[PDB]
Amino acid sequence: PKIMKVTVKTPKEKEEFAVPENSSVQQFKEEISKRFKSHTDQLVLIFAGKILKDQDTLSQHGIHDGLTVHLVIKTQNRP
């Protein structure tokens, strides 16, 4: 079993994290925040046309290995 590689497309760049498809949005955006040097509150994930909240899990939206989430970062001071 390989670990699930989730690509995150941001205004800044494009990254890819490794999660055991158990990491929901509340766990996943923490991995984003430390890497992009952003606050988790400044991170809003979007997929299927709707915003992924902490009640949302990436895996439930069909975001598995090779899929990409659309992130919008609102730090301003991290361009």
Side-chain angles (χ1 to χ4, degrees):
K2 185 187 62 179
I3 197 169
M4 194 183 76
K5 310 306 298 301
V6 191
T7 306
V8 184
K9 200 290 180 58
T10 67
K12 307 169 60 62
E13 61 187 301
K14 57 180 298 299
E15 184 54 67
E16 184 181 277
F17 302 95
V19 299
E21 74 186 272
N22 189 90
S23 310
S24 308
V25 173
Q26 23 69 327
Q27 290 171 327
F28 184 65
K29 95 301 192 190
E30 304 184 295
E31 306 311 288
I32 300 176
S33 60
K34 62 172 63 61
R35 221 293 288 126
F36 289 79
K37 303 295 169 62
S38 304
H39 293 265
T40 50
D41 180 41
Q42 288 167 326
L43 306 177
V44 288
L45 292 178
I46 297 84
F47 194 92
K50 66 95 62 195
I51 68 293
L52 312 186
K53 304 294 288 296
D54 60 272
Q55 63 174 29
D56 293 76
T57 74
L58 42 72
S59 183
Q60 191 60 213
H61 294 64
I63 310 169
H64 292 103
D65 182 76
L67 285 300
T68 308
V69 196
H70 299 244
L71 175 57
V72 177
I73 306 189
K74 300 184 178 301
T75 51
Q76 77 168 29
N77 296 91
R78 289 70 186 107

Coordinates of all heavy atoms in Angstrom, one line a residue:
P1 N 0.8 -1.2 0.0 CA 0.0 0.0 0.0 C 0.9 1.3 0.0 O 1.6 1.5 1.0 CB -0.9 0.0 1.2 CG -0.3 -1.1 2.1 CD 0.4 -2.1 1.1
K2 N 0.8 2.0 -1.1 CA 1.4 3.4 -1.2 C 0.6 4.4 -0.4 O -0.6 4.2 -0.3 CB 1.6 3.8 -2.7 CG 2.4 5.2 -2.9 CD 2.4 5.7 -4.3 CE 1.0 5.9 -4.9 NZ 1.0 6.5 -6.3
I3 N 1.2 5.4 0.1 CA 0.5 6.5 0.8 C -0.1 7.5 -0.3 O 0.5 7.6 -1.4 CB 1.5 7.3 1.7 CG1 0.8 8.1 2.8 CG2 2.6 8.1 1.0 CD1 1.6 8.6 3.9
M4 N -1.2 8.1 0.0 CA -2.0 8.8 -1.0 C -1.4 10.2 -1.2 O -1.4 11.1 -0.3 CB -3.5 8.9 -0.5 CG -4.5 9.3 -1.6 SD -6.1 9.5 -1.0 CE -6.1 11.0 -0.1
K5 N -1.0 10.5 -2.5 CA -0.3 11.7 -2.9 C -1.4 12.8 -3.4 O -1.9 12.6 -4.5 CB 0.7 11.5 -3.9 CG 1.7 10.3 -3.6 CD 2.4 10.5 -2.2 CE 3.3 11.7 -2.1 NZ 4.4 11.7 -3.2
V6 N -1.7 13.8 -2.5 CA -2.7 14.8 -2.8 C -2.0 16.1 -3.3 O -1.2 16.7 -2.5 CB -3.5 15.2 -1.5 CG1 -4.8 16.0 -1.9 CG2 -4.0 13.9 -0.8
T7 N -2.2 16.5 -4.5 CA -1.7 17.7 -5.1 C -2.6 18.9 -4.7 O -3.8 18.8 -4.7 CB -1.6 17.6 -6.6 OG1 -0.8 16.4 -7.0 CG2 -0.9 18.9 -7.3
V8 N -1.9 20.0 -4.2 CA -2.6 21.2 -3.8 C -2.2 22.4 -4.8 O -1.0 22.7 -4.9 CB -2.3 21.6 -2.3 CG1 -3.1 22.9 -1.9 CG2 -2.5 20.5 -1.4
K9 N -3.1 22.9 -5.5 CA -2.9 24.0 -6.5 C -3.2 25.4 -5.8 O -4.4 25.6 -5.4 CB -3.8 23.8 -7.8 CG -3.3 24.6 -9.0 CD -3.5 26.1 -9.0 CE -3.0 26.8 -10.2 NZ -3.7 26.3 -11.4
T10 N -2.2 26.2 -5.6 CA -2.3 27.5 -4.9 C -2.1 28.7 -5.8 O -1.5 28.5 -6.9 CB -1.3 27.5 -3.6 OG1 0.0 27.5 -4.1 CG2 -1.6 26.2 -2.8
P11 N -2.4 29.9 -5.3 CA -2.0 31.2 -6.1 C -0.5 31.4 -6.2 O 0.0 32.1 -7.1 CB -2.7 32.3 -5.2 CG -2.9 31.7 -3.8 CD -3.3 30.3 -4.2
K12 N 0.2 30.7 -5.3 CA 1.7 30.8 -5.1 C 2.4 29.8 -6.1 O 3.3 30.3 -6.9 CB 2.0 30.5 -3.7 CG 1.2 31.3 -2.6 CD 1.4 30.9 -1.2 CE 2.8 30.9 -0.6 NZ 3.4 32.2 -0.6
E13 N 2.0 28.6 -6.0 CA 2.7 27.5 -6.7 C 1.8 26.2 -6.8 O 0.6 26.3 -6.6 CB 4.0 27.2 -5.8 CG 3.7 26.7 -4.4 CD 5.0 26.6 -3.5 OE1 5.8 25.8 -3.9 OE2 5.0 27.3 -2.5
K14 N 2.4 25.0 -7.0 CA 1.7 23.7 -6.9 C 2.6 22.7 -6.1 O 3.8 22.5 -6.4 CB 1.4 23.2 -8.3 CG 2.6 23.0 -9.3 CD 2.2 22.4 -10.7 CE 1.6 21.0 -10.6 NZ 2.5 20.0 -10.0
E15 N 2.0 22.2 -5.0 CA 2.7 21.3 -4.1 C 1.9 19.9 -4.1 O 0.9 19.8 -4.7 CB 2.7 22.0 -2.7 CG 3.4 21.2 -1.6 CD 4.9 20.9 -1.9 OE1 5.7 21.8 -2.1 OE2 5.2 19.7 -2.1
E16 N 2.5 18.9 -3.4 CA 1.9 17.6 -3.2 C 2.3 17.0 -1.9 O 3.5 16.8 -1.6 CB 2.3 16.7 -4.4 CG 1.6 15.3 -4.4 CD 2.1 14.4 -5.6 OE1 1.6 14.6 -6.7 OE2 3.1 13.6 -5.4
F17 N 1.3 16.7 -1.0 CA 1.6 16.1 0.3 C 1.3 14.6 0.3 O 0.5 14.1 -0.6 CB 0.7 16.8 1.3 CG 1.0 18.3 1.4 CD1 0.2 19.2 0.7 CD2 2.1 18.8 2.2 CE1 0.5 20.6 0.7 CE2 2.3 20.2 2.2 CZ 1.5 21.1 1.5
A18 N 1.8 13.9 1.3 CA 1.6 12.4 1.5 C 0.8 12.2 2.7 O 1.2 12.5 3.8 CB 3.0 11.7 1.6
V19 N -0.4 11.6 2.6 CA -1.4 11.4 3.6 C -2.0 10.0 3.4 O -2.2 9.5 2.3 CB -2.6 12.5 3.7 CG1 -2.0 13.9 3.9 CG2 -3.4 12.4 2.4
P20 N -2.4 9.2 4.5 CA -2.9 7.8 4.4 C -4.4 7.7 4.1 O -5.1 6.8 4.6 CB -2.5 7.3 5.8 CG -2.8 8.4 6.7 CD -2.3 9.7 6.0
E21 N -4.8 8.7 3.2 CA -6.3 9.0 2.9 C -7.2 9.1 4.1 O -8.4 9.2 4.0 CB -6.8 8.0 1.8 CG -7.1 6.6 2.2 CD -7.5 5.7 1.0 OE1 -8.7 5.7 0.7 OE2 -6.7 5.1 0.4
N22 N -6.7 9.1 5.3 CA -7.4 9.3 6.6 C -7.4 10.8 7.0 O -8.4 11.3 7.6 CB -6.8 8.5 7.7 CG -7.6 8.4 9.0 OD1 -8.5 7.5 9.2 ND2 -7.4 9.3 9.9
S23 N -6.4 11.5 6.6 CA -6.2 12.9 6.8 C -7.3 13.7 6.2 O -7.3 13.9 5.0 CB -4.8 13.4 6.3 OG -3.8 12.5 6.8
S24 N -8.2 14.2 7.0 CA -9.3 15.0 6.6 C -8.8 16.5 6.5 O -7.7 16.8 6.8 CB -10.5 14.9 7.6 OG -10.8 13.5 7.8
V25 N -9.7 17.4 6.0 CA -9.3 18.8 5.8 C -8.7 19.5 7.0 O -7.7 20.2 6.9 CB -10.6 19.6 5.2 CG1 -10.3 21.1 5.1 CG2 -11.1 19.0 3.9
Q26 N -9.3 19.3 8.2 CA -8.8 19.8 9.5 C -7.3 19.3 9.8 O -6.6 20.0 10.5 CB -9.8 19.5 10.7 CG -10.8 18.4 10.5 CD -10.3 17.0 10.5 OE1 -9.2 16.7 10.1 NE2 -11.0 16.0 11.1
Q27 N -7.0 18.2 9.3 CA -5.6 17.6 9.5 C -4.7 18.0 8.3 O -3.5 18.2 8.5 CB -5.7 16.0 9.6 CG -6.4 15.5 10.9 CD -6.6 14.0 10.9 OE1 -6.9 13.4 9.9 NE2 -6.6 13.4 12.1
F28 N -5.2 18.1 7.1 CA -4.5 18.3 5.9 C -4.0 19.7 5.7 O -2.8 19.9 5.3 CB -5.4 17.9 4.7 CG -4.7 17.9 3.3 CD1 -3.6 17.1 3.1 CD2 -5.1 18.8 2.3 CE1 -3.0 17.1 1.9 CE2 -4.4 18.8 1.1 CZ -3.4 18.0 0.9
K29 N -4.8 20.7 6.0 CA -4.5 22.1 5.8 C -3.4 22.6 6.8 O -2.8 23.6 6.7 CB -5.8 23.0 5.8 CG -6.2 23.7 7.2 CD -6.5 22.8 8.4 CE -7.1 23.5 9.5 NZ -7.2 22.6 10.8
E30 N -3.2 21.8 7.9 CA -2.0 22.0 8.8 C -0.7 21.7 8.1 O 0.3 22.4 8.4 CB -2.2 21.0 10.1 CG -3.6 21.2 10.8 CD -3.7 20.3 12.0 OE1 -3.7 19.1 11.9 OE2 -3.7 20.9 13.2
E31 N -0.7 20.6 7.3 CA 0.5 20.3 6.5 C 0.8 21.3 5.4 O 2.0 21.6 5.1 CB 0.3 18.9 5.9 CG -0.1 17.8 6.9 CD 0.8 17.7 8.1 OE1 2.0 17.3 7.9 OE2 0.4 18.2 9.2
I32 N -0.3 21.9 4.9 CA -0.2 23.0 4.0 C 0.4 24.3 4.7 O 1.4 24.9 4.2 CB -1.6 23.4 3.4 CG1 -2.2 22.2 2.6 CG2 -1.5 24.6 2.5 CD1 -3.6 22.4 2.1
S33 N -0.2 24.6 5.9 CA 0.2 25.9 6.5 C 1.7 26.0 6.9 O 2.3 27.0 6.7 CB -0.7 26.1 7.8 OG -0.5 25.0 8.7
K34 N 2.2 24.9 7.5 CA 3.6 24.9 7.9 C 4.6 25.0 6.6 O 5.7 25.5 6.7 CB 3.9 23.6 8.7 CG 3.7 22.3 7.9 CD 4.2 21.0 8.7 CE 3.4 20.8 10.0 NZ 2.0 20.6 9.8
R35 N 4.1 24.4 5.5 CA 5.0 24.3 4.3 C 5.0 25.7 3.5 O 6.0 26.2 3.1 CB 4.5 23.1 3.4 CG 5.7 22.3 2.7 CD 6.5 23.1 1.7 NE 5.7 23.3 0.5 CZ 5.4 24.5 -0.1 NH1 5.8 25.7 0.4 NH2 4.8 24.5 -1.3
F36 N 3.8 26.3 3.4 CA 3.5 27.6 2.7 C 3.8 28.8 3.7 O 3.7 29.9 3.2 CB 2.1 27.6 2.1 CG 1.9 26.7 0.9 CD1 1.7 25.3 1.1 CD2 1.9 27.2 -0.4 CE1 1.5 24.5 0.0 CE2 1.7 26.4 -1.4 CZ 1.5 25.0 -1.3
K37 N 4.1 28.5 5.0 CA 4.3 29.5 6.0 C 3.1 30.4 6.2 O 3.3 31.6 6.5 CB 5.7 30.2 5.7 CG 6.9 29.2 5.6 CD 7.2 28.5 6.9 CE 8.2 27.4 6.7 NZ 9.5 27.8 6.2
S38 N 1.9 29.8 6.1 CA 0.6 30.5 6.2 C -0.1 30.1 7.5 O 0.3 29.1 8.1 CB -0.2 30.1 4.9 OG 0.5 30.4 3.7
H39 N -1.1 30.8 7.9 CA -2.0 30.4 8.9 C -3.1 29.5 8.3 O -3.6 29.7 7.2 CB -2.7 31.6 9.7 CG -1.7 32.4 10.5 ND1 -1.5 32.3 11.8 CD2 -0.9 33.5 10.1 CE1 -0.6 33.1 12.2 NE2 -0.2 33.9 11.2
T40 N -3.6 28.5 9.1 CA -4.7 27.5 8.7 C -6.0 28.2 8.5 O -6.8 27.8 7.6 CB -4.8 26.4 9.7 OG1 -5.0 26.9 11.0 CG2 -3.7 25.4 9.7
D41 N -6.2 29.3 9.2 CA -7.4 30.2 9.1 C -7.4 31.0 7.8 O -8.5 31.3 7.3 CB -7.4 31.1 10.4 CG -8.6 32.1 10.4 OD1 -9.8 31.7 10.1 OD2 -8.4 33.3 10.8
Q42 N -6.2 31.2 7.3 CA -6.0 31.9 6.0 C -6.2 31.0 4.8 O -6.2 31.4 3.6 CB -4.7 32.6 5.9 CG -4.6 33.9 6.9 CD -3.2 34.4 7.1 OE1 -2.2 33.6 7.2 NE2 -3.1 35.7 7.2
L43 N -6.2 29.7 5.1 CA -6.4 28.6 4.0 C -7.8 28.2 3.9 O -8.4 27.7 4.8 CB -5.5 27.4 4.4 CG -4.0 27.7 4.7 CD1 -3.3 26.4 5.2 CD2 -3.3 28.3 3.5
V44 N -8.4 28.3 2.7 CA -9.7 27.8 2.3 C -9.5 26.8 1.1 O -9.1 27.3 0.0 CB -10.8 28.9 2.1 CG1 -11.2 29.5 3.4 CG2 -10.3 30.0 1.0
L45 N -9.8 25.5 1.3 CA -9.8 24.6 0.2 C -11.1 24.6 -0.5 O -12.2 24.9 0.0 CB -9.5 23.1 0.8 CG -8.1 22.9 1.4 CD1 -8.0 21.4 2.0 CD2 -7.0 23.1 0.3
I46 N -11.1 24.4 -1.9 CA -12.3 24.3 -2.7 C -12.1 23.1 -3.7 O -11.0 22.9 -4.2 CB -12.5 25.6 -3.7 CG1 -12.7 26.9 -2.8 CG2 -13.6 25.4 -4.7 CD1 -11.5 27.6 -2.3
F47 N -13.2 22.3 -3.8 CA -13.3 21.2 -4.7 C -14.8 20.9 -4.9 O -15.6 21.1 -4.0 CB -12.5 20.0 -4.1 CG -12.3 18.8 -5.1 CD1 -11.1 18.8 -5.8 CD2 -13.2 17.8 -5.3 CE1 -10.8 17.7 -6.7 CE2 -13.0 16.8 -6.2 CZ -11.8 16.7 -6.9
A48 N -15.1 20.4 -6.2 CA -16.4 20.1 -6.6 C -17.3 21.4 -6.7 O -18.5 21.4 -6.8 CB -17.1 19.1 -5.8
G49 N -16.6 22.6 -6.7 CA -17.3 23.9 -6.8 C -17.6 24.5 -5.4 O -18.1 25.6 -5.3
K50 N -17.4 23.7 -4.3 CA -17.8 24.1 -2.9 C -16.5 24.1 -2.0 O -15.5 23.5 -2.3 CB -18.9 23.1 -2.4 CG -18.5 21.6 -2.2 CD -18.0 21.3 -0.7 CE -19.2 21.6 0.3 NZ -18.7 21.6 1.7
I51 N -16.6 24.9 -1.0 CA -15.5 25.0 0.0 C -15.4 23.8 0.9 O -16.5 23.4 1.5 CB -15.5 26.4 0.9 CG1 -16.8 26.4 1.9 CG2 -15.5 27.6 0.0 CD1 -18.2 26.5 1.3
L52 N -14.2 23.2 1.1 CA -14.0 22.1 2.0 C -13.7 22.7 3.4 O -12.7 23.3 3.7 CB -12.8 21.3 1.5 CG -12.7 20.9 0.0 CD1 -11.6 19.9 -0.3 CD2 -14.1 20.3 -0.4
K53 N -14.7 22.4 4.3 CA -14.6 22.8 5.7 C -14.0 21.7 6.5 O -13.6 20.6 6.0 CB -16.0 23.2 6.2 CG -16.7 24.3 5.4 CD -16.0 25.7 5.6 CE -16.2 26.3 7.0 NZ -17.6 26.6 7.2
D54 N -13.9 21.8 7.9 CA -13.4 20.8 8.8 C -14.3 19.6 8.8 O -13.9 18.4 9.1 CB -13.0 21.3 10.2 CG -14.2 21.9 10.9 OD1 -14.5 23.2 10.7 OD2 -14.9 21.2 11.6
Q55 N -15.6 19.8 8.5 CA -16.7 18.8 8.4 C -16.5 17.9 7.1 O -17.0 16.8 7.0 CB -18.1 19.4 8.4 CG -18.4 20.3 7.2 CD -19.8 20.9 7.1 OE1 -20.5 21.0 8.1 NE2 -20.3 21.1 5.9
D56 N -15.7 18.5 6.2 CA -15.4 17.8 4.9 C -14.1 17.0 5.1 O -13.2 17.4 5.8 CB -15.2 18.9 3.8 CG -16.5 19.6 3.4 OD1 -17.0 20.5 4.1 OD2 -17.1 19.3 2.3
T57 N -14.0 15.9 4.4 CA -12.8 15.1 4.2 C -12.5 15.1 2.7 O -13.4 15.0 1.9 CB -12.9 13.6 4.8 OG1 -13.7 12.9 3.9 CG2 -13.6 13.6 6.2
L58 N -11.2 15.2 2.4 CA -10.8 15.2 1.0 C -11.2 13.9 0.2 O -11.7 13.9 -0.9 CB -9.3 15.6 0.8 CG -8.2 15.0 1.8 CD1 -8.0 13.5 1.6 CD2 -6.9 15.7 1.8
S59 N -11.0 12.8 1.0 CA -11.3 11.4 0.4 C -12.8 11.2 0.0 O -13.1 10.5 -1.0 CB -10.8 10.4 1.5 OG -11.0 9.0 1.0
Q60 N -13.7 11.8 0.8 CA -15.1 11.7 0.6 C -15.5 12.5 -0.7 O -16.5 12.1 -1.4 CB -15.9 12.3 1.8 CG -17.4 12.0 1.8 CD -17.8 10.5 1.7 OE1 -18.8 10.1 1.1 NE2 -17.1 9.7 2.4
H61 N -14.7 13.5 -1.1 CA -15.0 14.3 -2.4 C -14.3 13.6 -3.6 O -14.3 14.2 -4.7 CB -14.5 15.7 -2.2 CG -15.3 16.4 -1.1 ND1 -15.3 16.0 0.2 CD2 -16.2 17.5 -1.2 CE1 -16.2 16.8 0.8 NE2 -16.7 17.6 0.0
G62 N -13.7 12.4 -3.4 CA -13.0 11.7 -4.5 C -11.7 12.2 -4.7 O -11.1 12.1 -5.8
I63 N -11.1 12.9 -3.7 CA -9.7 13.4 -3.8 C -8.8 12.4 -3.3 O -8.6 12.2 -2.0 CB -9.5 14.8 -3.0 CG1 -10.6 15.8 -3.4 CG2 -8.1 15.4 -3.2 CD1 -10.7 17.0 -2.4
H64 N -8.3 11.5 -4.2 CA -7.3 10.4 -3.9 C -6.0 10.7 -4.6 O -5.7 11.8 -5.0 CB -8.0 9.1 -4.2 CG -9.1 8.7 -3.3 ND1 -10.5 8.8 -3.6 CD2 -9.1 8.3 -2.0 CE1 -11.2 8.4 -2.6 NE2 -10.4 8.1 -1.6
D65 N -5.2 9.6 -4.8 CA -3.9 9.7 -5.4 C -4.0 10.2 -6.8 O -4.7 9.6 -7.7 CB -3.2 8.3 -5.3 CG -1.8 8.3 -5.9 OD1 -0.9 8.8 -5.2 OD2 -1.6 7.8 -7.0
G66 N -3.4 11.4 -7.1 CA -3.3 12.0 -8.5 C -4.3 13.1 -8.6 O -4.3 13.8 -9.6
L67 N -5.2 13.3 -7.7 CA -6.2 14.4 -7.7 C -5.6 15.6 -7.1 O -4.6 15.6 -6.3 CB -7.5 13.9 -6.9 CG -8.5 12.9 -7.6 CD1 -9.0 13.5 -9.0 CD2 -7.9 11.5 -7.8
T68 N -6.3 16.8 -7.4 CA -5.8 18.1 -7.0 C -6.9 19.0 -6.4 O -8.0 19.1 -7.0 CB -5.2 18.8 -8.3 OG1 -4.2 18.0 -8.9 CG2 -4.5 20.2 -7.9
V69 N -6.6 19.5 -5.2 CA -7.5 20.5 -4.5 C -7.2 21.9 -4.9 O -6.0 22.2 -5.0 CB -7.4 20.3 -2.9 CG1 -8.7 21.0 -2.3 CG2 -7.3 18.9 -2.5
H70 N -8.2 22.8 -5.1 CA -8.0 24.2 -5.4 C -7.9 25.0 -4.1 O -9.0 25.2 -3.5 CB -9.1 24.7 -6.3 CG -9.2 24.0 -7.7 ND1 -8.9 24.6 -8.9 CD2 -9.5 22.7 -8.0 CE1 -9.1 23.7 -9.9 NE2 -9.4 22.6 -9.3
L71 N -6.7 25.4 -3.7 CA -6.6 26.2 -2.5 C -6.5 27.7 -2.8 O -5.8 28.1 -3.8 CB -5.3 25.8 -1.7 CG -4.9 26.6 -0.4 CD1 -6.0 26.6 0.6 CD2 -3.6 26.0 0.2
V72 N -7.1 28.5 -1.9 CA -7.0 30.0 -2.0 C -6.4 30.5 -0.6 O -7.1 30.3 0.4 CB -8.4 30.6 -2.2 CG1 -8.3 32.2 -2.2 CG2 -9.0 30.1 -3.6
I73 N -5.2 31.0 -0.7 CA -4.5 31.5 0.5 C -4.7 33.0 0.6 O -4.6 33.7 -0.4 CB -3.0 31.2 0.5 CG1 -2.8 29.6 0.2 CG2 -2.2 31.7 1.7 CD1 -1.3 29.1 0.4
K74 N -5.0 33.5 1.8 CA -5.3 34.9 2.1 C -4.4 35.5 3.1 O -4.8 36.3 4.1 CB -6.8 35.0 2.5 CG -7.8 34.5 1.4 CD -9.3 34.7 1.8 CE -10.3 34.2 0.7 NZ -10.1 34.9 -0.6
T75 N -3.1 35.2 3.0 CA -2.0 35.8 3.9 C -1.7 37.2 3.5 O -1.4 38.0 4.4 CB -0.7 34.9 3.7 OG1 -0.4 34.8 2.3 CG2 -0.9 33.5 4.4
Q76 N -1.7 37.5 2.2 CA -1.2 38.7 1.5 C 0.4 38.9 1.7 O 1.1 39.0 0.7 CB -1.9 40.1 1.8 CG -1.6 40.7 3.2 CD -2.2 42.1 3.4 OE1 -3.2 42.5 2.8 NE2 -1.5 42.9 4.2
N77 N 0.9 38.9 2.9 CA 2.3 39.0 3.2 C 3.2 37.8 2.9 O 4.4 37.8 3.1 CB 2.5 39.5 4.7 CG 1.9 40.8 5.0 OD1 0.8 41.0 5.4 ND2 2.7 41.9 4.8
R78 N 2.5 36.7 2.4 CA 3.2 35.5 1.9 C 2.8 35.4 0.4 O 1.9 34.6 0.0 CB 2.9 34.2 2.6 CG 3.5 34.0 4.1 CD 2.8 35.0 5.1 NE 3.5 34.9 6.4 CZ 4.3 35.9 6.9 NH1 4.6 37.0 6.2 NH2 4.8 35.7 8.1
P79 N 3.5 36.1 -0.5 CA 3.3 36.1 -2.0 C 4.0 34.9 -2.7 O 3.2 33.9 -3.0 CB 3.8 37.5 -2.5 CG 5.0 37.8 -1.5 CD 4.6 37.1 -0.2

